[PDB]
Design a protein around this ligand. Structure first.
Ligand SMILES: *C(=O)[C@]1([C@@H](O)[C@@H]2C=CCCC2)NC(=O)[C@@H]2CCO[C@@]21C
Lengths: 230, 208, 225, 203, 230, 230, 234, 212, 239
């Protein structure tokens, strides 16, 4: 896995590869590792896919219930505190290395949350197996108050670096750009644009396939029964 | 049972006027000399001092427990403190409780005090909860680097017991890695607890 | 009357009528007398014999080596309080290794009775305890009440016909501090005799060095004169 | 340890050694490995000494409680069942109980092998202990149904003696008990030192 | 939990709640349990709409293969008693491997009723139970009557429910010390008929033979015995 | 009058807590105890109208230790008085366990007023018919908690019978201008002036927390002021 | 009032007094202590001849040495005797000795007054049964009386049940400290017969002896009850 | 982490016709270090019996406190001091109550029963009870047991009557056996506490032993 | 079970929670009135500080409490209930800060207090806490001032201006009849103290009123020292 969220001038760009491996085998080639938390907060997670999915769903439910009861926009530090407390109370057994990326009244905030509950506000973060290959790009191409497009390209290139250099990472680069609908208006609605398959590396696609599929296995049917679908 | 932030050796010995306890004022983090001027003894009552060799975190937790219980019994008794025997019995029962809960206080705790009847009471409770009352108790390397230097002068004059404890702690400073700094002396007498000036007990360094 | 519903209900006058009913239940117990000298403490009482051929129900109990209590009221509640006090003495002789002070036992039993009177669904103990102890605190006598309070006394009488015993104790109050063990026991028996309606009177005597002991029947004959 | 109990036409003969030994040292040679449970029921002690003694006196308490609660006394099957259920509730606590519940009830003689593990095996011939294999060899080789009381008691005594000889864990004195309809009878405690025949040169 | 001490003493010394539970019993259907040297017989009268309901809801229950059980009173309190009694029979088998003594199980049912008389927030069982059966440990058929008060007494022939006094008088008059099994059947059937103006279509008769299970009398044999008694 | 006076949590149609008012009546029945903050310390004086001459001289305390720096004068229902004393000791011990430092009379009073209020706020409790005056020189605090749970810091507090006149007399002195040793005669004169003639034998249980006591609670020594009167 | 653990303005637990009344509504029972043994004679109320008398046993053997006879509510007495049996077997298990008569009496009494109401989850009402606990302890027969209040008293002679007061009045001038067990049985059966409303018979009476010579509490069989009723003056 | 200190020290009990002589070394010591040269391990439980515990001293103190608590409870609830046989059963049950967290102490309950006869009961840490004429516990149990076997021959011939050894002879046997153990067992040493329970009550003697 | 509708918090035959209304009257029993005014630039809460006896240390006779640094609470009601509510609002705030990681907003604190007052008005074994609570502060997420009132019923609302206590009806009437979108914090403070003074019908001194004026500058809660209170009172006595 390669997940990387950075903070650009107008918002946050989160990114994730789409490769879930069931050991040394690529179980999923379109895996969704960017989890919607709230309209302003997205978490891209690594570690155990079940743990990441469930904890992101649970915290998204908590913050949706929060925004409903209280009418308040969930805060990125609030989401990060909830995530860190939950991961600490499970003593790292919920292997969800998360990167929270959102925009609240404090501006664009990217937090890391380790599976053991250790969080940290950082401008750019990379987690997962390819986290190092990604963070190199993030280390070299992130600067204060970069525009949306440069941060998008940097985070996509960091996810691509994780994809190519790391075996646990691969397939496509899904991005999610949290940004204010009116960047000049700091009080404008925080919207998100999810770029599914933002990068689709052509050198990483299936380049060959038998047009006449050769098969010498013959199916012998012991018994057939047809039953209505209602 | 694990010792990290450890208090060094303690040598307590009864002399004519009371109990003389010596120990360095240094807490060692593993082997590092981390903290200085940290007394290993805590005056829990006007005539009851409590020291401990071993983990000093477990001795601060034990002192919290002791002070809370003494405060309970003092509020009950309108100012009257627990006796040295009662305080040591509570420490024995709480350290055995901790050992029985499998979370032992990894500190050998010396209770030195004058009971209201005037009899010197010096007792020790090891991390496991085994307690014993004795006229002289060494804990840590003060137990090991002792010999007959205390036993021969125990219950003797203050000068003789002080010299014996000084010999033992010269041995400790020479041959204990965790022995760092001045050796504080505390006299628990029926007239109160007096912290004598800490003394640098130098090993004989003409050996080289 | 209408506010005599629970031990948790205050009457418009500030009185807990169920607490007062329990106090009367104590006042309906057999005459109990307690005395306190500078060296010894004594509790005595005419034990109750429900039937002619039934023995006199024990009234004096030994809580600890130097602590005893004379119950007045529901003897079952008295036994429950004796169990509680013995547990407290055993947890003070476990935590501290010495004998608890009868003052601390009075505090604990008062606290328990008050918790009985402060929470609904509980009744005040229908028994009053004359506790005598001896220790570093000296000899001390405490009359614990159902309401949840203990009154320290040099002498005291409770139960039925206890006004005559109280009058005797008031007359001889200044004698008690210097009275010896034998003289304090004699004063106890002669304060009970004024309440007579011996083989009924049981007397527990304790001293600073003397452990609490219960004398009954002919054993007390030597203390009559 | 070595305890044996067998049902012959005349009753139940229960013979037990008296050795308690841990490792090499013989902690005792006068250990009583037969604990009475009912007037006509006993329970043998093998394996852990404390466990067997506590649980057999607890079973005696439960049998007395049942007999006083209900006029009918607790049977040997019911008693062994109580014991085995209690011991099985402590599975995984490293209890060590080997115990033959030998009694005469309304349905006749009954021996139930009870173990810490919860096994409750009815049978007419059991032996529990380190030397129980030797007692089993002597029993199964010399056991008859029509043995007199003396013959059956001597069979149990000699089986325990051979177990004590061939096992370091068995020794002391053979406590022999004869259980009949009438009730438990304690035959005698025979020192295995006296049972050994020193005129033999083979053992 | 709720503890309102439903059952309390009255100034005259009576547990009025036990009186009311007895009233509930006395409004229940009549039950008549009689015994012989080798067979027990229970006859419960049944009030029902023969044309509109199934008469298969029986007051006679089988706590175990050797414990037969009938009741008079609230059918739900009786169902709870029978369920607990069956559980106790199986638990006695678990704990002892021996069939629960009829005295033992009757004591258990009476102790259930008694605990309801003693437990705060618990309404005394408005049911009087006839626990009958056979003990191999005693070689005697037993018929215990457990009351709502929690008192159980063995009887040679006992009746509960409505008309219990008339049926008791009939039992006392027509009881033989050494009845045969068919004589016990005749006594129970006649005692129930003394208050019932209907034949097999109303009565329900079960029985337990020595070392046997509970067998419900047929509607043919029952009618034959009814006619023979008359 | 109306039925709103039985349940402590019940509010009278005028908003009155009748059970709390009756607890306050219980306080007002008791002999007055007072406290005054002085230059050198705080002096708590409790009038003990000895019901019997047999009561131990100097026994039956009304001023209690709560902490090595906090004393507690008590007025009202003596069972409730000592219950609150022990609950204050437990609250101080729990405060030390949770926070390490020794509790202060303001927050000790808040924590004990929490129990006072719970008594008449949740059902199943009786309001404490006791007013507790916590004094601490080391905290320069004299906080009196009332039966309702209302607690106020006082320059000079007093509760019990003739408490209004006692407060009016305490008002005549600027207590902080003087020390405890010269405050003792003034408070003693106040109570003696208000002492009722009906009570022949009585005592003035004075305690002080001062520099002379090193801030520790201590009964005023008999030589300084013989507490016992006739 | 209206709650079980309430004290009357006279200082009495109302439920306790009402349980005493319930005991006064129970079958009579006379316990006569003599140096040879303690003898219970109990009225077995038989509403019918079909009632198995052995099953309405008002006498219960708590242990080999100690027994108990009830008066009042037979079910509450069953709870009390069950507790006493468990206590006696626990005492034998814990101290390898028969439980003292006073000890088991005190245990059941402590159980007696533990009733409560109004607190979250205990018995809800006092035991409506008074027990005459008797047994052999250290080669001596001890007779104790427990009533619903939880108070127990050692007794040389005692009566519980409907005829309790009349039985005690009859025992006034009939009971002596040196009677033989023969005389104790005769006195117990005579007092019971006097305080019951039916002619005494072996089937409507239950007799039991805590016998010092045997050191055991046995319950008399029909033959022994006949052997006693035959000797009576009537 | 092992919650026991495995303290050494020997206790030798000898039951007589009318006495019980338990001699235990005072020394408290484990791992070549003597925590306390004097640390009494025989305690007068009541006027009927004494308990001698050898092993972990924390467990000795805890078990002796529990036994004193239970004997006080028995005196309060059963109105007489617990007998030596009752104390023995209580010791067995108390030790077994911790069957899964055993007191690592070997117990000798020596007392005088209602018959006036001496009663010694030997124990293992998990609560095995055994009515014994003699027993040895602690570090020098293996050393001391042959001494008692030779003195009495009970192990050599189990079924023969236990020899009528006088009170003073049994005290001398315990002293000599404790001295031999002290000579051989390093943990045994310092002072011998020789307690004797007789009809006259609990008597105690302190004899020096080799400190080394 | 009939008859509990007036003594317990269950609905009456006419559908009213009589105990809740009686808790409102118990709030009236506080003998003190609070007026809070909220403006775009500040929120000022003035509550009369009536010390009945001057033997009492006035610093302890307070109806204004620090729930958090940013959130204050002017609580009018039974003093015991007021202390319970300060401890329960502080507990709410601490639990919220421990879970969510940030200081509790005034709106969420008002919701939690309303939930507690609903558990009081529903659980018949819990007395309705007789405290009319004026929670106020500067919410960071909106960087705007929040002013909520939670009545003993739990009926919680956000207010431009609110009032509690004996003159609650008259104070609210005066507030609504004179509310303005003030342009300065000191005009909000002047209006607050003027409305409180007018409804209480007595001239105020700093000794006789606790005023907390949370501005955009001083967002953190603090009761104004007597100097600023006297200055505002003089400004209110100008006209
Ligand atoms: C990524 O860390 C990874 C993915 O399965 C990932 C898990 C969390 C989000 C969903 C998809 N976790 C793994 O266990 C493998 C090992 C290498 O990294 C994975 C692909």
């Amino acid at each position: 896995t390669t997940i990387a969220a950075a903070i650009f001038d107008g918002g946050v760009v989160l990114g994730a590869d789409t490769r879930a491996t069931a050991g040394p085998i690529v179980a999923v080639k379109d895996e969704m590792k960017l989890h919607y938390i709230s309209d302003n907060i997205w978490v891209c997670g690594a570690g155990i896919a079940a743990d990441n999915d469930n904890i992101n769903a649970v915290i998204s439910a908590k913050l949706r219930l929060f925004q409903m009861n209280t009418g308040l926009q969930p805060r990125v530090d609030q989401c990060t505190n909830i995530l860190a407390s939950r991961l600490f109370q499970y003593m790292g057994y919920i292997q969800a290395a998360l990167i929270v990326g959102g925009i609240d009244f404090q501006g664009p905030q990217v937090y890391q949350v380790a599976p053991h509950g250790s969080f940290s506000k950082q401008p750019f973060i990379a987690q997962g197996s390819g986290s190092l290959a990604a963070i190199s790009v993030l280390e070299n191409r992130w600067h204060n108050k970069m525009n949306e497009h440069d941060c998008m390209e940097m985070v996509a290139d960091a996810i691509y670096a994780g994809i190519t250099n790391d075996l646990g990472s691969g397939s496509h680069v899904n991005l999610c750009v949290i940004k204010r609908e009116n960047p000049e208006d700091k009080q404008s609605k925080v919207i998100y644009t999810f770029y599914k398959d933002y990068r689709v590396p052509h050198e990483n696609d299936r380049n060959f396939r038998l047009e006449p599929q050769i098969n010498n296995i013959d199916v012998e049917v012991i018994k057939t029964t047809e039953r209505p679908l209602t | 049972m694990q010792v990290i932030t450890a208090s060094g050796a303690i040598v307590a010995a009864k002399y004519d006027g009371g109990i003389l306890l010596a120990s360095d004022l240094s807490i060692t983090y593993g082997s590092m000399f981390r903290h200085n001027n940290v007394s290993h003894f805590v005056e829990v009552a006007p005539n009851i001092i409590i020291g401990a060799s071993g983990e000093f975190a477990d001795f601060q937790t034990l002192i919290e427990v002791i002070k809370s219980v003494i405060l309970q019994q003092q509020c009950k008794h309108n100012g009257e403190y627990l006796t040295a025997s009662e305080v040591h019995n509570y420490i024995k029962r709480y350290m055995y409780q901790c050992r029985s809960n499998m979370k032992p206080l990894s500190c050998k705790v010396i209770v030195a005090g004058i009971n209201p009847d005037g009899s010197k009471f010096l007792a020790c409770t090891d991390p496991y909860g085994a307690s014993w009352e004795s006229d002289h108790i060494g804990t840590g390397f003060g137990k090991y680097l002792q010999g007959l230097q205390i036993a021969d002068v125990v219950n003797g004059s203050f000068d003789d017991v002080k010299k014996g404890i000084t010999e033992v702690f010269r041995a400790v400073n020479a041959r204990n890695t965790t022995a760092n700094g001045k050796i504080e002396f505390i006299t628990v007498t029926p007239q109160g607890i007096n912290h004598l000036a800490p003394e640098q007990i130098d090993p004989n360094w003409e050996v080289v | 009357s209408k506010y005599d519903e629970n031990a948790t209900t205050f009457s418009p006058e500030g009185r807990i009528l169920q607490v007062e009913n329990a106090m009367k239940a104590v006042q309906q117990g057999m005459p109990t007398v307690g005395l306190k000298s500078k060296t010894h403490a004594v509790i005595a009482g005419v034990m109750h014999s429900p039937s002619e051929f039934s023995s006199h129900q024990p009234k004096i109990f030994k809580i600890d080596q130097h602590i005893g209590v004379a119950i007045s009221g529901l003897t079952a509640d008295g036994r429950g309080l004796c169990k509680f006090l013995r547990n407290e003495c055993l947890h003070h002789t476990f935590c501290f290794g010495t004998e608890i002070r009868v003052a601390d036992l009075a505090d604990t039993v008062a606290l328990q009775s008050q918790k009985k009177t402060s929470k609904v669904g509980k009744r005040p103990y229908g028994v009053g305890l004359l506790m005598i102890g001896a220790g570093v605190d000296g000899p001390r006598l405490f009359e614990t009440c159902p309401s949840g309070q203990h009154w320290e006394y040099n002498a005291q009488a409770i139960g039925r016909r206890a006004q005559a015993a109280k009058t005797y104790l008031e007359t001889n109050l200044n004698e008690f501090p210097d009275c010896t063990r034998d003289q304090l026991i004699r004063h106890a028996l002669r304060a009970l005799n004024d309440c007579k309606s011996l083989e009924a009177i049981a007397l527990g005597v304790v001293g600073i060095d003397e452990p609490f002991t219960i004398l009954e029947g002919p054993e007390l004959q030597k203390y009559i004169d | 340890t070595t305890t044996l109990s067998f049902i012959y036409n005349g009753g139940i003969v229960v013979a037990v050694d008296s050795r308690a030994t841990g490792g090499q040292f013989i902690f005792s040679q006068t250990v009583m490995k037969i604990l009475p449970l009912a007037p006509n029921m006993i329970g043998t002690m093998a394996g852990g000494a404390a466990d067997c003694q506590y649980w057999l006196r607890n079973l005696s308490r439960l049998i007395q409680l049942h007999k006083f609660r209900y006029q009918q006394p607790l049977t040997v099957a019911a008693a062994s069942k109580i014991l085995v259920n209690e011991l099985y509730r402590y599975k995984g606590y490293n209890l060590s109980i080997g115990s033959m519940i030998c009694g005469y009830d309304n349905t006749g003689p009954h021996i139930f092998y009870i173990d810490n593990h919860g096994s409750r095996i009815a049978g007419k011939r059991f032996s529990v202990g380190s030397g129980s294999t030797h007692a089993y060899g002597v029993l199964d080789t010399c056991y008859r149904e029509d043995m007199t009381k003396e013959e059956a008691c001597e069979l149990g005594r000699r089986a325990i003696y051979h177990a004590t000889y061939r096992d370091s864990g068995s020794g002391g004195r053979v406590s022999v008990v004869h259980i009949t309809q009438n009730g438990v009878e304690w035959i005698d405690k025979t020192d295995v030192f006296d049972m050994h025949d020193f005129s033999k040169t083979t053992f | 939990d709720y503890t309102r001490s439903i059952t309390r003493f009255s100034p005259d010394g009576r547990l009025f709640q036990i009186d009311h539970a007895h009233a509930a019993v006395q409004r229940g259907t009549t039950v008549v349990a009689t015994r012989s040297k080798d067979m027990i017989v229970i006859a419960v009268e049944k009030t029902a709409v023969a044309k509109l309901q199934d008469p298969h809801f029986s007051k006679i229950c089988s706590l175990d293969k050797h414990v037969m059980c009938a009741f008079a009173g609230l059918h739900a309190d009786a169902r709870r008693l029978i369920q607990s009694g069956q559980r106790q029979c199986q638990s006695h088998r678990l704990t002892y491997e021996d069939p629960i003594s009829i005295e033992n199980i009757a004591r258990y049912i009476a102790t259930l009723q008694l605990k309801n008389t003693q437990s705060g927030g618990a309404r005394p069982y408005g049911v009087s139970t006839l626990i009958c059966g056979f003990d191999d440990m005693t070689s005697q058929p037993h018929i215990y009557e457990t009351l709502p008060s929690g008192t159980y007494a063995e009887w040679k022939a006992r009746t509960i429910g409505r008309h219990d006094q008339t049926v008791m008088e009939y039992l006392e008059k027509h009881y033989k010390d050494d009845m045969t099994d068919e004589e016990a059947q005749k006594l129970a059937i006649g005692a129930l008929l003394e208050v019932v103006e209907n034949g097999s279509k109303n009565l329900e008769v079960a029985y337990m033979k020595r070392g046997g299970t509970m067998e419900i009398m047929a509607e043919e044999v029952l009618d034959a015995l009814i006619e023979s008694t008359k | 009058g109306s039925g709103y006076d039985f349940n402590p949590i019940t509010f009278s149609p005028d908003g009155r807590q009748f059970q709390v008012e009756y607890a306050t009546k219980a306080v007002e029945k008791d002999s007055l105890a007072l406290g005054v903050k002085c230059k050198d310390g705080i002096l708590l004086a409790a009038e003990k109208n000895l019901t019997s001459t047999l009561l131990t001289p100097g026994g039956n305390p009304r001023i209690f230790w709560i902490n090595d720096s906090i004393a507690c004068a008590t007025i009202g229902h003596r069972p409730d008085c000592y219950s609150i004393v022990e609950q204050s000791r437990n609250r101080a011990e729990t405060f030390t366990s949770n926070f390490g430092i020794k509790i202060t009379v303001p927050q000790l009073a808040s924590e004990v007023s929490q129990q006072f209020h719970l008594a008449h706020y949740y059902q199943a409790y009786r309001p404490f018919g006791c007013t507790v005056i916590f004094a601490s020189y080391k905290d320069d605090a004299l906080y009196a908690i009332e039966p309702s749970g209302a607690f106020y810091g006082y320059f000079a507090s007093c509760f019990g019978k003739n408490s209004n006149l006692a407060r009016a007399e305490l008002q005549k002195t600027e207590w902080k201008n003087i020390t405890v040793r010269e405050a003792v005669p003034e408070v003693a004169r106040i109570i003696k002036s208000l002492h009722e003639s009906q009570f022949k034998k009585w005592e003035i249980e004075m305690f002080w927390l001062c520099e002379e006591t090193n801030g520790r609670p201590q009964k005023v020594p008999e030589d300084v002021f013989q507490s016992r009167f006739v | 009032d209206r709650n079980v653990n309430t004290f009357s303005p006279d200082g009495r637990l109302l439920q306790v007094e009402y349980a005493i009344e319930a005991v006064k509504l129970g079958s009579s029972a006379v316990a006569i202590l003599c140096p040879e043994g303690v003898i219970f004679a109990v009225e077995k109320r038989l509403s019918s001849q079909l009632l198995i008398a052995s099953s309405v046993e008002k006498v219960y053997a708590i242990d080999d040495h100690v027994g108990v006879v009830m008066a009042g509510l037979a079910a509450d007495g069953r709870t009390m005797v069950e507790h006493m049996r468990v206590e006696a077997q626990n005492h034998r298990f814990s101290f390898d000795e028969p439980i003292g008569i006073k000890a088991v009496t005190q245990s059941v009494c402590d159980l007696a007054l533990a009733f409560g109401e109004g607190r979250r989850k205990q018995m809800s009402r006092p035991f409506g049964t008074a027990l005459l606990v008797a047994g052999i302890e250290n080669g001596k027969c001890h007779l104790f009386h427990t009533d619903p209040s939880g108070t127990y008293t050692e007794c040389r002679a005692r009566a519980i049940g409907g005829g309790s007061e009349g039985a005690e009045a009859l025992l006034r001038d009939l009971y002596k400290d040196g009677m033989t067990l023969h005389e104790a049985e005769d006195l117990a059966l005579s007092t019971l017969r006097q305080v019951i409303q039916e002619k005494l018979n072996e089937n409507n009476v239950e007799v039991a002896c805590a016998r010092v010579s045997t050191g055991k509490f046995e319950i008399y069989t029909s033959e022994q009850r006949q052997e006693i009723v035959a000797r009576l003056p009537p | 982490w092992s919650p026991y200190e495995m303290h050494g020290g020997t206790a030798i009990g000898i039951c007589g016709d009318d006495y019980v002589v338990i001699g235990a070394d005072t020394r408290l010591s484990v791992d070549y270090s003597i925590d306390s040269r004097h640390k009494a391990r025989i305690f007068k439980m009541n006027s009927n019996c004494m308990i001698s515990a050898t092993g972990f001293d924390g467990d000795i103190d805890a078990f002796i406190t529990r036994m004193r608590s239970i004997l006080l409870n028995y005196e309060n609830q059963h109105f007489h001091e617990m007998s030596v046989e009752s104390v023995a059963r209580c010791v067995s049950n108390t030790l077994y109550s911790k069957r899964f967290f055993p007191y690592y102490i070997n117990i000798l309950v020596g007392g005088i029963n209602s018959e006036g006869k001496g009663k010694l009961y030997g124990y293992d840490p998990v609560g095995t009870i055994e009515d014994l004429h003699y027993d040895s516990n602690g570090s020098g149990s293996s050393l001391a047991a042959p001494l008692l076997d030779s003195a009495f021959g009970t192990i050599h011939h189990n079924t023969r009557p236990f020899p009528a050894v006088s009170l003073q002879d049994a005290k001398n046997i315990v002293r000599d056996a404790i001295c031999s153990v002290t000579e051989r067992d390093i943990y045994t040493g310092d002072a011998l506490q020789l307690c004797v329970f007789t009809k006259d009550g609990f008597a105690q003697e302190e004899f020096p032993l080799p400190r080394h | 079970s009939s008859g509990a509708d007036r003594y317990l918090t269950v609905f009456s035959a006419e559908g009213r929670l009589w105990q809740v209304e009686y808790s409102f009257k118990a709030v009236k029993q506080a003998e003190v009135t609070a007026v809070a005014v909220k403006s775009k630039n500040a929120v000022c809460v003035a509550v009369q500080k009536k010390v009945s006896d001057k033997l009492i240390d006035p610093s302890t006779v307070t109806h204004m409490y620090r729930i958090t640094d940013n959130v204050g609470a002017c609580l009018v009601g039974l003093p015991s209930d007021v202390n319970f509510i300060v401890m329960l609002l502080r507990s709410f705030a601490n639990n919220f800060e421990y879970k969510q990681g940030f200081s509790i907003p005034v709106s969420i604190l008002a919701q939690m207090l309303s939930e507690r007052h609903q558990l009081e008005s529903q659980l018949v074994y819990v007395r309705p806490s007789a405290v009319s609570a004026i929670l106020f502060g500067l919410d960071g997420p909106s960087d705007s001032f929040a002013l909520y009132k939670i009545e003993p019923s739990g009926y919680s609302n956000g207010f431009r201006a609110v009032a509690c206590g004996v003159k609650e009806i008259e104070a609210m009437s005066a507030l609504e009849k004179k509310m303005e979108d003030f342009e300065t914090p000191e005009a909000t403070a002047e209006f607050t103290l003027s409305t409180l003074q007018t409804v209480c019908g007595v001239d105020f001194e700093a000794q006789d009123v606790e005023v907390s004026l949370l501005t955009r500058d001083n967002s953190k809660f603090s009761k104004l020292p007597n100097d600023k209170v006297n200055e505002i009172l003089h400004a209110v006595a100008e006209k």
